[PDB]
Amino acid sequence: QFLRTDDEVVLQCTATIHKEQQKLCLAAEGFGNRLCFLESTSNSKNVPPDLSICTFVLEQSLSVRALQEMLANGHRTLLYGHAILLRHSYSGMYLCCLSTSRKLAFDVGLQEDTTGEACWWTIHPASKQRSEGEKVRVGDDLILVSVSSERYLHLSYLHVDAAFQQTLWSVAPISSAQGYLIGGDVLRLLHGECLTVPSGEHEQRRTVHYEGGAVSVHARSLWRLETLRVAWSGSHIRWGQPFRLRHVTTGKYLSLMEDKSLLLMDKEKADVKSTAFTFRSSKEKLRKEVDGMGTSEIKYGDSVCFIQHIGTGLWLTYQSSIQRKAIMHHEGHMDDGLNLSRSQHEESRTARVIRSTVFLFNRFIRGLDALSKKAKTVDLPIESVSLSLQDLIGYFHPPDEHLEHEDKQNRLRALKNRQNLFQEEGMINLVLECIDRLHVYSSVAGREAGESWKSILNSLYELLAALIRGNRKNCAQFSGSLDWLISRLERLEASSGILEVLHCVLVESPEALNIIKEGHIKSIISLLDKHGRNHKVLDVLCSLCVCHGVAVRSN
Amino acid sequence: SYLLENSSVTPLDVAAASVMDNNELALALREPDLEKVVRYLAGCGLPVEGERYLDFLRFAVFCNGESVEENANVVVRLLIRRPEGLLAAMEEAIKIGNAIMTFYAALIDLLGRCAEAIRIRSILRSLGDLVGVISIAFQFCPDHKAAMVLFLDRVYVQDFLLHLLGFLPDLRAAASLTDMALALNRYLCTAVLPLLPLFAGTEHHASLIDSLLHTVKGCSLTKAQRDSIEVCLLSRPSMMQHLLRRLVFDVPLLNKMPLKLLTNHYERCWKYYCLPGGASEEELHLSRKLFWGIFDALYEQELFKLALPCLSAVAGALPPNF
Amino acid sequence: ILELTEQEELLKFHYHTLRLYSAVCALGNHRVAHALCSHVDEPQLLYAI
Amino acid sequence: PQFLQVPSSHEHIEVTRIDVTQKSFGSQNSSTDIMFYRLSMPIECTYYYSVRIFPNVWVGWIT
Amino acid sequence: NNNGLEIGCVVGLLTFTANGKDLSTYYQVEPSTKLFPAVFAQATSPNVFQFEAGLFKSEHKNPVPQCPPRLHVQFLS
């Protein structure tokens, strides 16, 4: 009925695209993207909207006057005339006005810290019905004005910019019970063993499987429960309200295809009655909607949940290395009452970033495939890549020494969890393929986009190192490519970067210490003839000499 | 507010005169009255009509030299929304409808008469085009540039200052004796605005001397002479002495009283050039020896010889219509 | 070496050699350690003390 | 006097690492006096080492 | 009279070929000692000096057939 502090909402408008008011909401990605864009929620039948990166949380709603004093240095209800703070509900980035163009309107972005006036945005109705001081209700057509630039959050023609013309930003709510299922939550699917999807570089990862053991840890056992509705997506999960399932790592919707089987298909093929399921308590096939958080119905831990497709009434059963293949059938077994379990927020935060790493580098691979074969211009992102490349280093930044111990341990425990997730989806291998195709020429492409080629390669290894520095696993996963790194060691371009990967591996892989041979180490000592005098080489040779604690005397 | 709604063309002249002088009154006005003005500007899509509104708004926010801020803020904020690229299409109109040319001059003056007060700079820095119109009005002429300079002065180092300088074309076209005759006396008060490497500055000091040669109108020349006394006080010293070398040729032409006062202005400048000198310093001792013939040539002379007393102390620092 | 305090890049590298030379003698590399007596010359180390 | 590499902080006498195996040098400045271009690495005891000259010169093989 | 190609070939003994033409009988003598490749200059123009039967990279470094002259980092000035 109202809008208060700490309530998840969206910012929706319309646009005149071919006689239809395209009901589009504000979208901005994060962790790869600082800029804002549009997501149409009109075609919810065929190409349903990515509602994860559209929602925003009203972190603080204070007036203009009660802010500048605080800036010189509690579910409060929103009133018109208050400057609100719109943190992005996924990336934790605050919505701000920028200092750039896309045209004398500034641009709208998601910056990191709440300091500065750009993060705050005042609300004013464009309605003579309601005025200032009135409680902001559900679904009021309102205008968002900045505080720094004091420009309107405007829908330009098809881009978001802080302009001087106004736009009615209709605010549909999403949510506001702990331990009960809430829609929108990325979560697993337990058995008593969990539902999985095939691993990296494996089919285009489309099959559906039950699997026990250590796949519950993995990201490929994560499933986002997306409702059909735009508003009140964070309603509590009831028995029988509809849900478009969508796999996290591939970014594909779980769809019933009558031609083959239950499959993972993309955004565009997944029509509603081909992909949306519901939940049943028994295996029977006996409400439409409520507007609110709804009935706090089903638990995470203690809930035996049968899964039924809407359009056909099929049930999620299994066929039968345990790669127990899950399918859809009219009856199935009595082992279809699948228990649920939520993911942690960081677990969800990694894996959405994983699909962000996916769509970014694969365009970067295919763009590199275009200008490697023939010269002269398939879209090759550079800045978008380097923005993510810098950010992921920051994502995998180690905890500070100037941090308190227990929090440092938690962040490090978080860090390894962040690291383990990229290995088990093959992001390490994905980076490994990008280092392949870039290390071809020597500064081909457009050399303002291809100008940062030197700085891209450096930070690739600096990413690649950082995904190693803690884990005994992932360094042992460089069993294979360790000889290849010593092969590209003598590129002399980013040769410190190859070494810094190879340093931190050989601190933590007694596995790979025993791999390395004469001519490899000869080449490492040969590199010291190349690059003058680097003590960097020496600590590598120190680490090739001494293990974790023991000696390798043949070395 | 009665009169505003009437004024569609005079009637808005009346509202103008009702405001101009008084600070007190100009503060007292409210914002929707000003909004009715600019909504009439929004109607101008084609003008001549809009120039009377912006003239009104010019006398809305400035009023005593001190740009009154509460007017200045709210005036501007509405103007972004409907102002209503625009530089270069104006540049067509010179060679062509005189009202379109005068229009944007008055628009830029409104913005020129106005300067948390930092964001208003930024929108006014959002309108680059600066030197473009400065290049136009070297060629009706005088009104456009003086509005651009006051825009340039409030909104928007010494390198870019010398970058702007056919102000020599103003000083040289003084001998055309009628639009240009009225131009030059307008650019005498415009010459006070540049009061606030060395080679191109010597051309401009000679251009200031060419304006002083056009001076050697009358009260405007007193604004030019005050612009001349501040110019030599602002400045190397040999380039100031190269300007004093062409002034020594004018000092020979001086000894009518305006050229002697220009020489009295160079006399305390010679007191400044004496400490830098302690070339033509021998000819500077000959200028004080020509001032001994000026002592042979002689209440206003008490002020002229007290400047020559500084020139007597300056000669001893060196002795220590074509 | 006494000068080489100020020769900072060259200070750092040679230090890492001393880690390296002490490295390769990791707990009883005697065939190596006889060889390093030729490189580093024990009475020089007595003087280094 | 002794040898030391050319850093970028200099009177702008520019070293350019170029590959077939050449290094150009520039003197668009108010420094003309003395330049001793000694490369880093010696020889001990077939292999021709070329020096291209656009504009005097003293080519040296110096211990 | 614009280009000069003064070439001090090595290997023990030295030779000079200036503009590809022999100006030899130079001070070419050392049994087993060292020689810096040096060009001593008074800066008469910019783009002043460009540097380079085996090649000089293959002599000096650790690889010694190394007949393509692959540049390194230690080629310093």
DSSP string, B119-155: HHHHHHH----HHHHHHHTT---HHHHHHHHHHHHHH
Taking residue B177's Cβ as centre, other Cβ atoms within 10 Å add up to 8
Helix axes B69-79, B31-43, angle to 10 degrees: 30
Long-range (24+ apart) CB contacts under 8 A made by A478-484 are A478/A505, A478/A509, A478/A512, A479/A509, A479/A511, A479/A512, A479/A515, A481/A432, A482/A512, A482/A515, A482/A516, A482/A520, A483/A515, A483/A520
Task: Give the whole-angstrom CA distance, residue B277 versus residue B267.
Answer: 15
B55 phi, psi to nearest 5 deg: -65, -40
Question: Would strands A159-163 and A152-156 be described as parallel, antiparallel, or unpaired?
Answer: antiparallel
**Of the candidates A310, A299, A294, the residue with the CA atom closest to the CA atom of residue A339:** A299
Question: Which chain E residues are within 8 Å of D12, Cβ to Cβ?
Answer: none
Q: How far is CA B56 from CA A18, B59, B65, B120, B140, in A?
A: 44, 5, 16, 20, 21
Task: Give the whole-angstrom CA distance, residue A342 versus residue A223.
Answer: 10
Cβ contact D26:E48 at 8 Å: yes
Identity of residue B40: Y
How far, rounded to the nearest angstrom, does the alpha carbon of residue A347 sit from its chain's CA centroid?
10
Contact C26 A538 (CB under 8 A): no
User: Which structure tokens are listed for A41?
Assistant: 């929620």
Question: Which chain B residues are within 8 Å of A99, Cβ to Cβ?
Answer: none
**Of the candidates B22, B15, B31, B117, the residue with the CA atom closest to the CA atom of residue B64:** B22
Question: Which chain A residues are within 8 Å of C22, Cβ to Cβ?
Answer: none
Q: Which residues contact B170 (CB under 8 A, 6 or more apart)?
A: B183, B184, B187, B211
Q: Residue A519, SS3?
A: helix
Query: Exposure of B196 by Cβ count < 10 A (0-12 exposed, 13-18 middle, 19+ buried)?
Result: exposed
Residues 1-49 of C with CB under 8 A from A: 9-10, 12-13, 15-17, 19-20, 23-24, 26-27, 29
For chain C, the first-to-last Cα distance in angstroms comes to 13
Q: How far is CA A199 from CA A422, A432, A517, in A?
A: 11, 16, 31
Chains D and C touch (3+ CB pairs under 8 A): no
Q: Residue D59, SS3?
A: strand
Task: Give the whole-angstrom CA distance, residue A402 versus residue E59.
Answer: 51
**Which residue among E51, E54, E74 sits closest to D41, beta carbon to beta carbon?**
E74
Maximum separation of any 2 CA atoms in chain B, in Å: 76
Cβ contact B111:B59 at 8 Å: no
Taking residue A514's Cβ as centre, other Cβ atoms within 10 Å add up to 12
Q: HEC profile for E2-55?
A: CCEEEEEEECCCEEEEECCEECCCCCCCCCCCCCEEEEEECCCCCCCEEECCEE
Task: Give the whole-angstrom CA distance, residue A65 versus residue A43.
Answer: 42
Question: Which chain C residues are within 8 Å of A528, Cβ to Cβ?
Answer: none
**Of the candidates A131, A229, A223, the residue with the CA atom closest to the CA atom of residue A181:** A223
Task: Give the whole-angstrom CA distance, residue B107 versus residue B89.
Answer: 15
Cβ contact A215:A196 at 8 Å: yes
**Of the candidates B160, B162, B158, B191, the residue with the CA atom closest to the CA atom of residue B174:** B191
CA atoms within 13 A on the CB side of E59: 21
Contact C29 A553 (CB under 8 A): yes
Cβ contact A264:A253 at 8 Å: yes
Cβ contact B230:B265 at 8 Å: no
DSSP string, A68-127: HHHHH---PBPBTTEEEEEEETTT-PEEEE-S-----SEEEEEES-S-SGGGEEEEEES-
User: Which structure tokens are listed for E47?
Assistant: 């783009």
Q: Residue B319, SS3?
A: coil
Task: Give the whole-angstrom CA distance, residue A9 versus residue A58.
Answer: 8
Question: Which chain E residues are within 8 Å of D21, Cβ to Cβ?
Answer: 51-52, 55, 57, 69, 71
Chain A: residue whose CA lies nearest to B77: A164
Q: How far is CA A303 from CA A223, A333, E29, in A?
A: 17, 18, 93
Task: Give the whole-angstrom CA distance, residue A469 versus residue A501.
Answer: 9
How far A288 CA sits from the closest chain B CA (Å)?
45
Chain A: residue whose CA lies nearest to E71: A530
User: Which structure tokens are listed for E23?
Assistant: 């100006």
User: Which structure tokens are listed for A281?
Assistant: 């308590």
Q: Residue A262, SS3?
A: strand
Identity of residue E66: Q
Residues 4-63 of D with CB under 8 A from E: 5-6, 13, 15, 17, 19-28, 31-63
Chains E and D touch (3+ CB pairs under 8 A): yes
Task: Give the whole-angstrom CA distance, residue A500 versus residue A490.
Answer: 14
Task: Give the whole-angstrom CA distance, residue E29 versus residue C17.
Answer: 36
Dihedral angle of Cα A267, A269, A274, A275, to the nearest 10 degrees: -20
Using alpha carbons only, what angle is made at residue B252 by residues B248 and B255, rounded to the nearest 5 degrees? 130
Chain A: residue whose CA lies nearest to E61: A529
Taking residue E23's Cβ as centre, other Cβ atoms within 10 Å add up to 12
A95 phi, psi to nearest 5 deg: -70, 130
Question: Which chain E residues are within 8 Å of A529, Cβ to Cβ?
Answer: 61-62, 72, 74
Using alpha carbons only, what angle is made at residue E21 by residues E20 and E24, rounded to the nearest 5 degrees? 120
**Of the candidates A360, A316, A319, the residue with the CA atom closest to the CA atom of residue A338:** A316
Instruction: List the single best residue of A525, A545, A546, A555 to mutate versus C (max C Cβ within 10 A).
Output: A545
**Of the candidates B250, B275, B267, the residue with the CA atom closest to the CA atom of residue B305:** B267
Q: What is the DSSP letter of B191?
A: G
User: Which structure tokens are listed for B169?
Assistant: 């074309």
Chain E: residue whose CA lies nearest to D57: E41
Contact E49 D22 (CB under 8 A): no
Dihedral angle of Cα A58, A64, A66, A68, to the nearest 10 degrees: 110
A35 phi, psi to nearest 5 deg: -95, 165
Query: Exposure of A178 by Cβ count < 10 A (0-12 exposed, 13-18 middle, 19+ buried)?
Result: exposed
Q: How far is CA A511 from CA A466, A478, A504, A514, C25, in A?
A: 19, 9, 13, 6, 21
Task: Give the whole-angstrom CA distance, residue A332 versus residue E44.
Answer: 91
Cβ contact A182:A197 at 8 Å: no
Using alpha carbons only, what angle is made at residue B170 by residues B165 and B173, rounded to the nearest 5 degrees? 140
Q: Residue A144, SS3?
A: strand
Chain A: residue whose CA lies nearest to C30: A553
**Which stretch of DSSP H or E encloses residue A186?**
strand A186-187
Dihedral angle of Cα A429, A430, A431, A432, to the nearest 10 degrees: 40
**Of the candidates A169, A128, A126, A164, the residue with the CA atom closest to the CA atom of residue A146:** A164
A423: region left, alpha or beta (phi > 0 left; psi from -120 to 50 alpha): alpha
Contact A539 C15 (CB under 8 A): no
Task: Give the whole-angstrom CA distance, residue D8 versus residue D11.
Answer: 9
Task: Give the whole-angstrom CA distance, residue A424 versus residue A334.
Answer: 31
The residues facing A263 across adjacent strands are A255
Q: How far is CA C4 from CA C11, C12, C13, C48, in A?
A: 6, 10, 11, 14
Task: Give the whole-angstrom CA distance, residue A78 versus residue A75.
Answer: 9
| A530 touching E (Cβ < 8 Å) | yes
Torsional sign, CA A25, A31, A32, A35: positive
Task: Give the whole-angstrom CA distance, residue A495 versus residue A540.
Answer: 13
A92 phi, psi to nearest 5 deg: 70, 25
Cβ contact A2:A135 at 8 Å: yes
Q: Which chains have 3+ CB pairs within 8 A of E? A: A, D
Cβ contact A547:A512 at 8 Å: no
Q: HEC profile for chain C?
A: CCHHHCCHHHHHHHHHHHHHHHHHCCCCCHHHHHHHHHHHCHHHHHHHC
Task: Give the whole-angstrom CA distance, residue A325 versus residue D63.
Answer: 76
Task: Give the whole-angstrom CA distance, residue A330 versus residue B59.
Answer: 83
Q: Which residues contact A62 (CB under 8 A, 6 or more apart)?
A: A70, A76, A82, A83
Rg of chain A, C-alpha, whole Å? 26
Q: Which chains have 3+ CB pairs within 8 A of A? A: B, C, E
Burial A399-425 (b: 16+ CB within 10 A, else e): beeeeeeeebeebeebbeebbbbbbbb
Task: Give the whole-angstrom CA distance, residue B253 versus residue B234.
Answer: 25
Q: How far is CA A534 from CA B89, B111, C36, C47, E77, in A?
A: 62, 60, 21, 27, 18
**Of the candidates B128, B127, B149, the residue with the CA atom closest to the CA atom of residue B138:** B149
**Of the candidates B287, B283, B294, B293, the residue with the CA atom closest to the CA atom of residue B266:** B287
Cβ contact B253:B296 at 8 Å: no
Cβ contact B47:B100 at 8 Å: yes
**Which stretch of DSSP H or E encloses residue A169?**
strand A169-170
Residue entry with tokens 């110096």:
D62
Torsional sign, CA B57, B59, B65, B70: negative
How far, rounded to the nearest angstrom, does the alpha carbon of residue C35 sit from its chain's CA centroid?
13
Q: Which chains have 3+ CB pairs within 8 A of B? A: A
**Of the candidates A145, A61, A165, the residue with the CA atom closest to the CA atom of residue A104:** A165
Residue entry with tokens 């028994």:
A282
Cβ contact A347:A222 at 8 Å: yes
Task: Give the whole-angstrom CA distance, residue A83 versus residue A107.
Answer: 18
Length of chain B: 322
A106: region left, alpha or beta (phi > 0 left; psi from -120 to 50 alpha): beta
**Of the candidates A117, A111, A110, A115, the residue with the CA atom closest to the CA atom of residue A146:** A117
Residues 95-114 of A with CB under 8 A from B: 104
Residue entry with tokens 């942690």:
A344
User: Which structure tokens are listed for A176?
Assistant: 């506001």
Q: Which residues contact A94 (CB under 8 A, 6 or more apart)?
A: A59, A85, A86, A87, A88, A110, A111, A112, A113, A114, A119
Cβ contact B45:B85 at 8 Å: no
Contact A551 C29 (CB under 8 A): yes
**Of the candidates B59, B5, B61, the residue with the CA atom closest to the CA atom of residue B33:** B5
How far A149 CA sits from the closest chain B CA (Å)?
7
Cβ contact A41:A21 at 8 Å: no
Chains C and B touch (3+ CB pairs under 8 A): no
Q: Residue A343, SS3?
A: coil
User: Which structure tokens are listed for B54?
Assistant: 């912006």
User: Structure resolution in Å?
Assistant: 4.2
Length of chain A: 555
Helical ranges in D1-63 per DSSP H: none
Taking residue C36's Cβ as centre, other Cβ atoms within 10 Å add up to 15
**Of the candidates A89, A97, A101, A144, the residue with the CA atom closest to the CA atom of residue A117:** A97
How far A523 CA sits from the closest chain E CA (Å)?
11
Q: What is the DSSP letter of A339?
A: -
Taking residue C24's Cβ as centre, other Cβ atoms within 10 Å add up to 20
**Which stretch of DSSP H or E encloses residue B24?**
helix B23-28
User: Which structure tokens are listed for A433?
Assistant: 């393929």
The residues facing E9 across adjacent strands are E15
Q: Which residues contact E33 (CB under 8 A, 6 or more apart)?
A: D44, D45, D63
Residue entry with tokens 């408008």:
A13
**Of the candidates A531, A156, C39, the residue with the CA atom closest to the CA atom of residue D40:** A531
Question: Which chain D residues are within 8 Å of E4, Cβ to Cβ?
Answer: 51-53, 57
Query: Exposure of C13 by Cβ count < 10 A (0-12 exposed, 13-18 middle, 19+ buried)?
Result: middle
Cβ contact A293:A235 at 8 Å: yes
Question: Which chain E residues are within 8 Å of D20, Cβ to Cβ?
Answer: 52, 69
Identity of residue A290: V
Task: Give the whole-angstrom CA distance, residue B210 versus residue B224.
Answer: 11
**Which stretch of DSSP H or E encloses residue A154?**
strand A152-156
Cβ contact A219:A351 at 8 Å: yes
Residue entry with tokens 């106005």:
B114
User: Which structure tokens are listed for C15?
Assistant: 């230090």
Question: Which chain A residues are within 8 Å of E62, Cβ to Cβ?
Answer: 526, 529
Question: Which chain E residues are within 8 Å of A531, Cβ to Cβ?
Answer: 72-74
Contact E74 A532 (CB under 8 A): yes
Instruction: List the single best residue of A164, A165, A166, A167 to mutate versus B (max B Cβ within 10 A).
Output: A164
C16: region left, alpha or beta (phi > 0 left; psi from -120 to 50 alpha): alpha
**Which stretch of DSSP H or E encloses residue A159?**
strand A159-163
Torsional sign, CA A455, A460, A461, A467: positive
Task: Give the whole-angstrom CA distance, residue B148 versus residue A541.
Answer: 69
